[PDB]
Amino acid sequence: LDGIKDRVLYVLKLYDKIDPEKLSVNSHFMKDLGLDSLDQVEIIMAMEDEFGFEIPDIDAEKLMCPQEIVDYIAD
Amino acid sequence: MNLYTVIFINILLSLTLILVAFWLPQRLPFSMKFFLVAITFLLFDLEIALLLPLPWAIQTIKTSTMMIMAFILVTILSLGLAYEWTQKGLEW
Amino acid sequence: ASATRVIQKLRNWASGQDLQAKLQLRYQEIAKRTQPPPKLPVGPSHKLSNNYYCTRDGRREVVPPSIIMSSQEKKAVTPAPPMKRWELSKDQPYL
Amino acid sequence: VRPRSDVTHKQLSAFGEYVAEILPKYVQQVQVSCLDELEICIHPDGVIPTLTFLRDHTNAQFKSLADLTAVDVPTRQNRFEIVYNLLSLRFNSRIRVKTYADELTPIDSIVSVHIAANWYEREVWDMFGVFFFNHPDLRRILTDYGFEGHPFRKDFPLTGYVELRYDDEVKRVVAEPVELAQEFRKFDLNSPWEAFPA
Amino acid sequence: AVIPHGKGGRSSVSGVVATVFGATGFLGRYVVNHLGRMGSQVIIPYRCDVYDIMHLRLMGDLGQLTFLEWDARDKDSIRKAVQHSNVVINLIGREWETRNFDFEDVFVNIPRAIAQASKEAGVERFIHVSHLNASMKSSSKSLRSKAVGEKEVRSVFPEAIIIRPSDIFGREDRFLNHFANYRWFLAVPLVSLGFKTVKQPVYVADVSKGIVNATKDPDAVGKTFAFTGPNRYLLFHLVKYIFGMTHRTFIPYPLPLFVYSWIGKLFGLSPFEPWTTKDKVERIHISDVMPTDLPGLEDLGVQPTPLELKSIEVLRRHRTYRWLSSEIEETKPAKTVNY
Amino acid sequence: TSVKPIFSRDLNEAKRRVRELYRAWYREVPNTVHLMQLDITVKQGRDKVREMFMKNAHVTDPRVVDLLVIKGKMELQETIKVWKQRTHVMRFFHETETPRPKDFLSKFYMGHDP
Amino acid sequence: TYKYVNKKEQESEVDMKSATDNAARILMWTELIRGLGMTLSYLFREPATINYPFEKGPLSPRFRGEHALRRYPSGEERCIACKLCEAICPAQAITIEAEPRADGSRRTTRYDIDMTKCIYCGFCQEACPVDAIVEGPNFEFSTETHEELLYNKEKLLNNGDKWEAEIAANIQADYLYR
Amino acid sequence: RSRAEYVVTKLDDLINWARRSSLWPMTFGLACCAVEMMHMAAPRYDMDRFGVVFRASPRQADVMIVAGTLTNKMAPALRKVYDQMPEPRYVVSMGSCANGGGYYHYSYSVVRGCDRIVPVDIYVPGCPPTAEALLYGILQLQRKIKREQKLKIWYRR
Amino acid sequence: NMTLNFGPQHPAAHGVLRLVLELSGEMVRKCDPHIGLLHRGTEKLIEYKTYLQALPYFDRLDYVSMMCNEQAYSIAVEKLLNIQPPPRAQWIRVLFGEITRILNHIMAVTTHALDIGAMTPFFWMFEEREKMFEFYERVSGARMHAAYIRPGGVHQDLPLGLLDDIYEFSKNFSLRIDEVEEMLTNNRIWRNRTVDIGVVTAEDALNYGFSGVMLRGSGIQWDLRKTQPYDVYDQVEFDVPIGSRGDCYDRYLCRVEEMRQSLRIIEQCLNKMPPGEIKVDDAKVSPPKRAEMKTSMESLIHHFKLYTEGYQVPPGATYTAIEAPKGEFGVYLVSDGSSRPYRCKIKAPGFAHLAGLDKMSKGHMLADVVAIIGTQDIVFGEIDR
Ligand SMILES: NC(=O)C1=CN([C@@H]2O[C@H](COP(=O)(O)OP(=O)(O)OC[C@H]3O[C@@H](n4cnc5c(N)ncnc54)[C@H](OP(=O)(O)O)[C@@H]3O)[C@@H](O)[C@H]2O)C=CC1
Ligand code: SF4
Ligand code: SF4
Known part of the structure; x- marks a missing residue:
C-alpha cells in the first residue's frame, strides 16, 4: 500500500503541471494545487495505466486527492 | 551441358532486362478454404506421382494387376474427393 | 458494306442474323445536310384579336393552397380509388 | 393554362380530413395545394405516429419514402421544416407530412418506419444540422470528413470558408481561408412590382 | 510598386515581382512556395525542360508565376528576365563541377553577371546566397569560390543582401539524406570517426522564410545574415541519429581523409551527378563556424526549427516496412556541442 | 426558457459526457499519430485536444453541450475508424497557413478592414 | 400493360x-x-472509327463549341454592352464593364469570358439582342496554360474574325428555327 | 551526321517517340467527362489506334485525365494517385469542371481547378469537352512530348 | 473482416465510390458505402440562380440520362406556374425522353459487363450511343448536356430532317440489342455471376425506397409513367417489363426489355407527332421568338426581363416525379414569389439504391459487390448532388 501510494505519487510527480513541492498525499489538486477538471481526468488515466485498473468517471470524479486515489486503488 | 547452356542464356536474358529496366530509367488474410485447397492439392499431387509411372507400367507383363491397381488408386482418391464434396470442403 | 459476298455470308451466319440488312455504319441514308429552310408555325396567342392575356395567364391566377383542418356513420376514405391491376401484355406476354 | 381535375382535389382533401381525424393529437394543418398535392402538417412529436399510421393502414398504405428534406426558413423560430414525401403504390397517391425542427431540438428518426430514411436523415444532419434521435448511425454523408459547418443552411456562405490546394513545403493538401479570384457577382433580381394578390 | 491588397493567402497581392534564377533547386522550391503563398509576382528563369519545373506551377497562382528560358553563358537571357522584376534572388549553385560549368561559374562568374544586369534594370534589391563559413582561403574550392563571389557582386550591386546559409536540413536535402543513404555502403566512413566537425543544420523552410522576409523588409541592406539553426552537433550523433531514425545499423569507422578525398574523386568522376565530391568531402568535415554575425533566423523573423522535430519526415523514406510506423518519440535524440 | 432536453438534463450530467469524450480523444491521440504516420508529437496533439475541448469551455446551456459531444464523438469515429487521412487531421494544426497578428498596430499596417 | 421477363x-x-x-x-x-x-x-x-486528324466527326450548325464576338459587315463590333449576356450566364463566366466610346457609341471596355468557368450552355448565344456573342463551331482550343483559357475582348473578337465566315453560315442555317 | 550533339538529338527523338506513341491513360473518372472519353475509347474515335490503351492501373499510367469536378473530398486522393504514378507522367485536365471550377466554381465543396491539386499539362475545354476535343488534347500532349529535349539538356548541362 | 477500403481503386467506378468493406478473406461481412466524393453543391447553388439558369444543373445531376432529368424540373416549374407545354413539345420530350432511356440502359448494361469482364458489348453499343448523341447535337447543339427541354416546352423545333433519322436508327437498333443478347442473355457464364446475386424481396424493396427497375425486377408493378402519366406518355402504348425471381440477371433482362419497349414508344412518337409550336405562347414564361423581339416592343421588354430577371413563379411547393431511366427522379421545388428558387431537393433514384447495397450484398464475395453496383446503375452525380 505504501508502495502503491508511491506509485500514485510517482504518477503525479510525472505529470507536468503538478508541482512536486505542493504534492502530498493530502493535496487536492482540483482545489489546491490548481489542476483543471480535465487535468484530473488525465491524471486518472495515467493511474489507470500505472495500476492497470480502469476507473469509472462516477468514481473518478470523486477522486480529487492523491490519497483518495490511493484509497480507491486500494479497493 | 547443352541444357545448361540454354538455361544460363535464359537467365542472362531475363537478368539483362531487369538490370536495364532499373538502370535505363536514368496482414491476416486467412481462410481455411485456402489452406484446405493447398492440402487437397498435394494429396492429389502425390497421387499424380503414383500415377505417373503408368506409361512404363503399361508394358508390364502382368497387365491385369496393373489395371487392378491403377483403377483402385483412382477410385479411392475420387472417393476422397467425394467426401470432400459431401463435407463442406470444396464448398468454399 | 462493300464486303465481298462470301465475307457477308460468313458474317450473316456467324452472327445468325442478316446483319447486312441493318448495317450500323451509315451510308447515304442519313438525312442530307443543308435540309431545306424551315418556316415554323406560329402557335396560338398570335391572333391580333380576342387575345387578352388576362384570359390566358395561368401563372398567377393560381391561389394560395386550400386549407383543411387548420388548428387556428362517417365512412372511411382512401387517398384515392384503389389502383387497378395491370394486365398482361398481348403481343408478348412472356419474354 | 394547365388542365386541372377537381376529382383529385376532392379525393385528396377528404383523405386529409380522414388522416386528421385519425391522428388529431399531432395534425396541426392539412392542406391541398392548387396542384392537387396533400400536405398534412404534424407536431414534431407526431413523426413516428403519423408515419406509421400511413405506412400500415388498410385505407391509407404509404409504403415508400420518396424523400426527406429540410427547407430552412431563417425567419421561422423553428428554422428547419422537415418534409417527408411518401408514395402509395396501392392507391397511386402521394402525401407530404412536414414538421418543424429548430437547430438544437432534435426530431425522432423514422428509420424504424422506413429504412429508406437511414441515408436521407444523415443527409439532413450533414447539410442542415437537425439531429435525429434513435438513428442507427448518424454521421456526415455528403460533406468532407473534416468539414465544419452545415452547408445548406441559408446562413452558410456559398463559397464557404475553406478551400484546398497542394503545398510543396508540406507535401500535402492544405486548407486555407477561401480567397476567391472573382467573387460571386450577386445580381439583385427582384422587381419592385408585384404580380397578383396572392 | 504594388500596393498590397488582399487577406494574405493565394489569389491576393503582395507587390513583390521577383526574378529567381535557380528556383528549380531544393532551396528554390521552398523560396517560390512562400513567395507564391504570399501572393508575390515570381519570374522563374529556367533552363531544364518544362517537364521538370511543373512542380512549381501549382505553387503560386495564375499569372503570378512566369517561366523564362535562360542560358547562363548568354547575357541577353538574364537581361530580359530582370527587365520587369524589382527583386532579384540568386540561388545558383552546384556541388559537382560540371563539364561546361566550373565552381567559379556557378558561384562567382554567373551570379555576378546576374546582379550586374539587375542594377542596369533598376531592381530595388538583390539577394545573393553563398555557403556558410566561406573563406577566400577555405580548403574546398567551392567555399572559397563562393567567397570570391560575395565580394564581386557587391561591386556590381552595392548594398545587395548576402544571406550565407549553413548546410541545409530538409526533405530532399543532401546533408540529411546523404548520410542516411550510406546504408548502401556497408560501412559508413567518417573522417576522425565523425568528430571535431561540429555542425549546425538549419531547416530549409526557416531558410526560405528568412529569405522571403528579406525581400519584404527595409532593415536588410548590405546585410550578410547567417541562417544557422537551433542546435549544433558533432557529426557523430548526427550520423548515428540519422541511422537511428532510419533504423539502420550504425557502424562508425574512421577513414583517413587523405584517402577519402580520393573516394570523393572517384564518385566525382561519375558522369551522372557524382554522389560525393572531393569538394563535398572537405565541406562535410569542414567544421561549422561559430555564431557571431549579423543574425539570420529570428533576426529576420523566423524562429529556427530543431532538427529532431522534422527529421522524421526527411528520413522516413529510408526506413523499412518494419519501422515505418515507428515514431520520433520511440527514437532517441542526438546531443549538441556548444563547442 | 422552458426548453426540452436533448440528452442531458443539466450541465452537470452533460459534463459527464464531455469527460468521457476527452478521455476517448486522449487515449486516441497516440494511435492516430502512428496509424497516420503524422509528423506530430503525441504530447503536442494531446494539447490540441485540450485546446478544442476548451475553445468551447464558455457554453453554459446543457442542450448545446450535448450536441457538441455528439459532434465530437462523430469526429473521433472518423479518426479511429479511419476515414479521415492525414490531410484531414493535420488541418487541425493549421500548419501551412500564416498566423495573423491581433495587435492593432499590426493590423493597421496590413489590412484595410480589421 | 406488363410483361414477365424470366418467368417460366x-x-x-x-x-x-x-x-x-x-x-x-x-x-x-x-x-x-x-x-x-x-x-x-x-x-x-x-x-x-475515323482517322481523327484527317476525317472529322460530323457536327451540325447548332454545335456550341467555342465563344466568339461578331462584328457588323461595316466593321463595327456588334456588342452594345447591354450586359444581359452577363445576367443570364449560369456560371458567372462573362464579366463586362463599359463606358461611352469617344464616338459616343456604347461599347464594352472589357469583355472577359472565363472558358474554364463557362459550361457552354449556349444561353449567351440565345440572350444577345444584336447577337454579338455566338457559340462558334471550333471545339479544338485545348491550351497548355490555364491563363490562355481565360479570354478577353481581343481574343474573342479575333476568334470572331477568324471564324466569321462559318459562324455566318451556321447562323444563316439556324435562324429560322430560332 | 557526325557530332555528339546530333547523336543526342536523334536518341531523345527516339525516347520521345516511344513515350509519345504509347501513352497509357489513367482516367480519374469523376463526374461526366469520363463518359465523353468512354466515347473516345469507343469505336467512332478509337484511342487505342493512337497507342493510348483503354485503361491501365495507376501504377502503369503515363497520363492522367482528370474528368469531372474535383471536390474537396476527392482532392486528397487525386494527389495520392498522381503521386503514386510512375515518374514519367503527364496530366490532362478535361472539362470546365476540372480546368477551373466550371459550373460549381463557387461551391464550398469543389476545388476551383485540378491545377491547384496536380500540375496540369493540357487543359481540354468544354462542359462535356467533345471526344474529338479530348482526342485533339491527347494529340496536343503528343506534340508537347515530341518537343521535350531531356537528353539535349543533360549533354549541355 | 479487414477493412479494404475498395472503390478508390476505380474497380466498379460509375463515379468514385469509397466502399469501405470488412472482408473475412473473400467474403463480405459489411459494406458501408461512402458518398459525397462528388458532392458539388448542386442544391445550394440553385437557390442563387434563376429558374432558367438552374436548368443546366439538372442535366449534370445524372448526365447519362441528360434530358429525362430536365423534364422533371420542367414539369415541376410548369406546375408551379400552372402552365403546360404545347402539344408538339410534349411529344418531343417523350421522343427524347425515350431515346435517353435507351442511352442510359446501353450505359448500364454494357458498363455492367465491362466490370464483369465482357468488353465487346460496350464497344458494340457505344457506337449506337454515339449515333444517338448526334441526335442530341442536331437538336440541341450539345452531344450531352443539351439544355433542350426547358421549363415551358422545348427550346427549338426539331431540325428539318431529324425525325427521319431517328427512324433509320430505330429501325435497326433492335438487331443491335439482339446481338448483345446472343452474347450475354444466355451466356453460360453471365447467368452464373448474375443469377441469384442481390435478390431483393418485394416488401423490402418498397421499404428501402428502391422505386425503379429494382422494384419492378422484384415483381412489384409500378411505372410512374403508367400509374401517374406525365407529358403524353399516356397517349402511347408500352408494356412495363415486370420481373420475377428478382436478382441481377432478372433486372438486367428488364433493362434490355425497356430498351425494347422504348423503341415501341419512339416509333409511335415519330408516327404521331403533331404540327404546332414547341414552346408556350406566354411571353410571360417562354422567351419571345427572335424575329419578334427585334420588331415588337412588347417582345423586347419580355425578352429583356425574362433573360435578366426571370419567370417569377408564383409562391408554392411541389414534388413532381417522373420515371427517369434509373428510377423515380423527383424535384421538390419550394418557391417564394421570386424569380430564383428557394429550395430544390433532387430525389435521386440512387441515394436509395446505394443504401440497399448493404442489405443486398450480404455474405457475398468481392466480385459480387462489383456485380451489384452495376445492377443499381449508380451515377454518383445524382447520389452526391
Ligand atoms: N545545403 C544546401 O543546399 C546549401 C546551399 N547553399 C547555397 O544555396 C543555393 C541553392 O542551393 P540548392 O538549391 O541546394 O542548389 P541545387 O543543386 O538545388 O541547384 C540550385 C539551382 O541552381 C541552378 N543551376 C545550377 N547550375 C547552373 C548553371 N550552370 N546554369 C544555370 N543554372 C544553374 C539549378 O538549375 P538546373 O537544375 O535547372 O540546372 C538549380 O535550380 C546554392 O547556390 C548554394 O550555394 C548554401 C549552403 C547550404
Ligand atoms: S448581350 Fe450580346 S450585346 Fe449585349 S452585351 Fe452580351 S454580347 Fe454584347
Ligand atoms: S465540366 Fe461540364 S461536363 Fe465535365 S464535369 Fe463539370 S459539368 Fe460535367
Whole structure:
C-alpha cells in the first residue's frame, strides 16, 4: 500500500503541471494545487495505466486527492 | 551441358532486362478454404506421382494387376474427393 | 458494306442474323445536310384579336393552397380509388 | 393554362380530413395545394405516429419514402421544416407530412418506419444540422470528413470558408481561408412590382 | 510598386515581382512556395525542360508565376528576365563541377553577371546566397569560390543582401539524406570517426522564410545574415541519429581523409551527378563556424526549427516496412556541442 | 426558457459526457499519430485536444453541450475508424497557413478592414 | 400493360430428348460456341472509327463549341454592352464593364469570358439582342496554360474574325428555327 | 551526321517517340467527362489506334485525365494517385469542371481547378469537352512530348 | 473482416465510390458505402440562380440520362406556374425522353459487363450511343448536356430532317440489342455471376425506397409513367417489363426489355407527332421568338426581363416525379414569389439504391459487390448532388 501510494505519487510527480513541492498525499489538486477538471481526468488515466485498473468517471470524479486515489486503488 | 547452356542464356536474358529496366530509367488474410485447397492439392499431387509411372507400367507383363491397381488408386482418391464434396470442403 | 459476298455470308451466319440488312455504319441514308429552310408555325396567342392575356395567364391566377383542418356513420376514405391491376401484355406476354 | 381535375382535389382533401381525424393529437394543418398535392402538417412529436399510421393502414398504405428534406426558413423560430414525401403504390397517391425542427431540438428518426430514411436523415444532419434521435448511425454523408459547418443552411456562405490546394513545403493538401479570384457577382433580381394578390 | 491588397493567402497581392534564377533547386522550391503563398509576382528563369519545373506551377497562382528560358553563358537571357522584376534572388549553385560549368561559374562568374544586369534594370534589391563559413582561403574550392563571389557582386550591386546559409536540413536535402543513404555502403566512413566537425543544420523552410522576409523588409541592406539553426552537433550523433531514425545499423569507422578525398574523386568522376565530391568531402568535415554575425533566423523573423522535430519526415523514406510506423518519440535524440 | 432536453438534463450530467469524450480523444491521440504516420508529437496533439475541448469551455446551456459531444464523438469515429487521412487531421494544426497578428498596430499596417 | 421477363410459364417435364439436348448444352458448351460466332461475325464487319486528324466527326450548325464576338459587315463590333449576356450566364463566366466610346457609341471596355468557368450552355448565344456573342463551331482550343483559357475582348473578337465566315453560315442555317 | 550533339538529338527523338506513341491513360473518372472519353475509347474515335490503351492501373499510367469536378473530398486522393504514378507522367485536365471550377466554381465543396491539386499539362475545354476535343488534347500532349529535349539538356548541362 | 477500403481503386467506378468493406478473406461481412466524393453543391447553388439558369444543373445531376432529368424540373416549374407545354413539345420530350432511356440502359448494361469482364458489348453499343448523341447535337447543339427541354416546352423545333433519322436508327437498333443478347442473355457464364446475386424481396424493396427497375425486377408493378402519366406518355402504348425471381440477371433482362419497349414508344412518337409550336405562347414564361423581339416592343421588354430577371413563379411547393431511366427522379421545388428558387431537393433514384447495397450484398464475395453496383446503375452525380 505504501508502495502503491508511491506509485500514485510517482504518477503525479510525472505529470507536468503538478508541482512536486505542493504534492502530498493530502493535496487536492482540483482545489489546491490548481489542476483543471480535465487535468484530473488525465491524471486518472495515467493511474489507470500505472495500476492497470480502469476507473469509472462516477468514481473518478470523486477522486480529487492523491490519497483518495490511493484509497480507491486500494479497493 | 547443352541444357545448361540454354538455361544460363535464359537467365542472362531475363537478368539483362531487369538490370536495364532499373538502370535505363536514368496482414491476416486467412481462410481455411485456402489452406484446405493447398492440402487437397498435394494429396492429389502425390497421387499424380503414383500415377505417373503408368506409361512404363503399361508394358508390364502382368497387365491385369496393373489395371487392378491403377483403377483402385483412382477410385479411392475420387472417393476422397467425394467426401470432400459431401463435407463442406470444396464448398468454399 | 462493300464486303465481298462470301465475307457477308460468313458474317450473316456467324452472327445468325442478316446483319447486312441493318448495317450500323451509315451510308447515304442519313438525312442530307443543308435540309431545306424551315418556316415554323406560329402557335396560338398570335391572333391580333380576342387575345387578352388576362384570359390566358395561368401563372398567377393560381391561389394560395386550400386549407383543411387548420388548428387556428362517417365512412372511411382512401387517398384515392384503389389502383387497378395491370394486365398482361398481348403481343408478348412472356419474354 | 394547365388542365386541372377537381376529382383529385376532392379525393385528396377528404383523405386529409380522414388522416386528421385519425391522428388529431399531432395534425396541426392539412392542406391541398392548387396542384392537387396533400400536405398534412404534424407536431414534431407526431413523426413516428403519423408515419406509421400511413405506412400500415388498410385505407391509407404509404409504403415508400420518396424523400426527406429540410427547407430552412431563417425567419421561422423553428428554422428547419422537415418534409417527408411518401408514395402509395396501392392507391397511386402521394402525401407530404412536414414538421418543424429548430437547430438544437432534435426530431425522432423514422428509420424504424422506413429504412429508406437511414441515408436521407444523415443527409439532413450533414447539410442542415437537425439531429435525429434513435438513428442507427448518424454521421456526415455528403460533406468532407473534416468539414465544419452545415452547408445548406441559408446562413452558410456559398463559397464557404475553406478551400484546398497542394503545398510543396508540406507535401500535402492544405486548407486555407477561401480567397476567391472573382467573387460571386450577386445580381439583385427582384422587381419592385408585384404580380397578383396572392 | 504594388500596393498590397488582399487577406494574405493565394489569389491576393503582395507587390513583390521577383526574378529567381535557380528556383528549380531544393532551396528554390521552398523560396517560390512562400513567395507564391504570399501572393508575390515570381519570374522563374529556367533552363531544364518544362517537364521538370511543373512542380512549381501549382505553387503560386495564375499569372503570378512566369517561366523564362535562360542560358547562363548568354547575357541577353538574364537581361530580359530582370527587365520587369524589382527583386532579384540568386540561388545558383552546384556541388559537382560540371563539364561546361566550373565552381567559379556557378558561384562567382554567373551570379555576378546576374546582379550586374539587375542594377542596369533598376531592381530595388538583390539577394545573393553563398555557403556558410566561406573563406577566400577555405580548403574546398567551392567555399572559397563562393567567397570570391560575395565580394564581386557587391561591386556590381552595392548594398545587395548576402544571406550565407549553413548546410541545409530538409526533405530532399543532401546533408540529411546523404548520410542516411550510406546504408548502401556497408560501412559508413567518417573522417576522425565523425568528430571535431561540429555542425549546425538549419531547416530549409526557416531558410526560405528568412529569405522571403528579406525581400519584404527595409532593415536588410548590405546585410550578410547567417541562417544557422537551433542546435549544433558533432557529426557523430548526427550520423548515428540519422541511422537511428532510419533504423539502420550504425557502424562508425574512421577513414583517413587523405584517402577519402580520393573516394570523393572517384564518385566525382561519375558522369551522372557524382554522389560525393572531393569538394563535398572537405565541406562535410569542414567544421561549422561559430555564431557571431549579423543574425539570420529570428533576426529576420523566423524562429529556427530543431532538427529532431522534422527529421522524421526527411528520413522516413529510408526506413523499412518494419519501422515505418515507428515514431520520433520511440527514437532517441542526438546531443549538441556548444563547442 | 422552458426548453426540452436533448440528452442531458443539466450541465452537470452533460459534463459527464464531455469527460468521457476527452478521455476517448486522449487515449486516441497516440494511435492516430502512428496509424497516420503524422509528423506530430503525441504530447503536442494531446494539447490540441485540450485546446478544442476548451475553445468551447464558455457554453453554459446543457442542450448545446450535448450536441457538441455528439459532434465530437462523430469526429473521433472518423479518426479511429479511419476515414479521415492525414490531410484531414493535420488541418487541425493549421500548419501551412500564416498566423495573423491581433495587435492593432499590426493590423493597421496590413489590412484595410480589421 | 406488363410483361414477365424470366418467368417460366410452366414446368416442362424432362423428356430424354429434352434431357440430352440440355446435357449436350452443358457438356459441349453449345451456347458458349454461339457467343464466339457473334464476335467472329463482326471481325468481318467494316470498323466504324475515323482517322481523327484527317476525317472529322460530323457536327451540325447548332454545335456550341467555342465563344466568339461578331462584328457588323461595316466593321463595327456588334456588342452594345447591354450586359444581359452577363445576367443570364449560369456560371458567372462573362464579366463586362463599359463606358461611352469617344464616338459616343456604347461599347464594352472589357469583355472577359472565363472558358474554364463557362459550361457552354449556349444561353449567351440565345440572350444577345444584336447577337454579338455566338457559340462558334471550333471545339479544338485545348491550351497548355490555364491563363490562355481565360479570354478577353481581343481574343474573342479575333476568334470572331477568324471564324466569321462559318459562324455566318451556321447562323444563316439556324435562324429560322430560332 | 557526325557530332555528339546530333547523336543526342536523334536518341531523345527516339525516347520521345516511344513515350509519345504509347501513352497509357489513367482516367480519374469523376463526374461526366469520363463518359465523353468512354466515347473516345469507343469505336467512332478509337484511342487505342493512337497507342493510348483503354485503361491501365495507376501504377502503369503515363497520363492522367482528370474528368469531372474535383471536390474537396476527392482532392486528397487525386494527389495520392498522381503521386503514386510512375515518374514519367503527364496530366490532362478535361472539362470546365476540372480546368477551373466550371459550373460549381463557387461551391464550398469543389476545388476551383485540378491545377491547384496536380500540375496540369493540357487543359481540354468544354462542359462535356467533345471526344474529338479530348482526342485533339491527347494529340496536343503528343506534340508537347515530341518537343521535350531531356537528353539535349543533360549533354549541355 | 479487414477493412479494404475498395472503390478508390476505380474497380466498379460509375463515379468514385469509397466502399469501405470488412472482408473475412473473400467474403463480405459489411459494406458501408461512402458518398459525397462528388458532392458539388448542386442544391445550394440553385437557390442563387434563376429558374432558367438552374436548368443546366439538372442535366449534370445524372448526365447519362441528360434530358429525362430536365423534364422533371420542367414539369415541376410548369406546375408551379400552372402552365403546360404545347402539344408538339410534349411529344418531343417523350421522343427524347425515350431515346435517353435507351442511352442510359446501353450505359448500364454494357458498363455492367465491362466490370464483369465482357468488353465487346460496350464497344458494340457505344457506337449506337454515339449515333444517338448526334441526335442530341442536331437538336440541341450539345452531344450531352443539351439544355433542350426547358421549363415551358422545348427550346427549338426539331431540325428539318431529324425525325427521319431517328427512324433509320430505330429501325435497326433492335438487331443491335439482339446481338448483345446472343452474347450475354444466355451466356453460360453471365447467368452464373448474375443469377441469384442481390435478390431483393418485394416488401423490402418498397421499404428501402428502391422505386425503379429494382422494384419492378422484384415483381412489384409500378411505372410512374403508367400509374401517374406525365407529358403524353399516356397517349402511347408500352408494356412495363415486370420481373420475377428478382436478382441481377432478372433486372438486367428488364433493362434490355425497356430498351425494347422504348423503341415501341419512339416509333409511335415519330408516327404521331403533331404540327404546332414547341414552346408556350406566354411571353410571360417562354422567351419571345427572335424575329419578334427585334420588331415588337412588347417582345423586347419580355425578352429583356425574362433573360435578366426571370419567370417569377408564383409562391408554392411541389414534388413532381417522373420515371427517369434509373428510377423515380423527383424535384421538390419550394418557391417564394421570386424569380430564383428557394429550395430544390433532387430525389435521386440512387441515394436509395446505394443504401440497399448493404442489405443486398450480404455474405457475398468481392466480385459480387462489383456485380451489384452495376445492377443499381449508380451515377454518383445524382447520389452526391
Ligand atoms: N545545403 C544546401 O543546399 C546549401 C546551399 N547553399 C547555397 O544555396 C543555393 C541553392 O542551393 P540548392 O538549391 O541546394 O542548389 P541545387 O543543386 O538545388 O541547384 C540550385 C539551382 O541552381 C541552378 N543551376 C545550377 N547550375 C547552373 C548553371 N550552370 N546554369 C544555370 N543554372 C544553374 C539549378 O538549375 P538546373 O537544375 O535547372 O540546372 C538549380 O535550380 C546554392 O547556390 C548554394 O550555394 C548554401 C549552403 C547550404
Ligand atoms: S448581350 Fe450580346 S450585346 Fe449585349 S452585351 Fe452580351 S454580347 Fe454584347
Ligand atoms: S465540366 Fe461540364 S461536363 Fe465535365 S464535369 Fe463539370 S459539368 Fe460535367
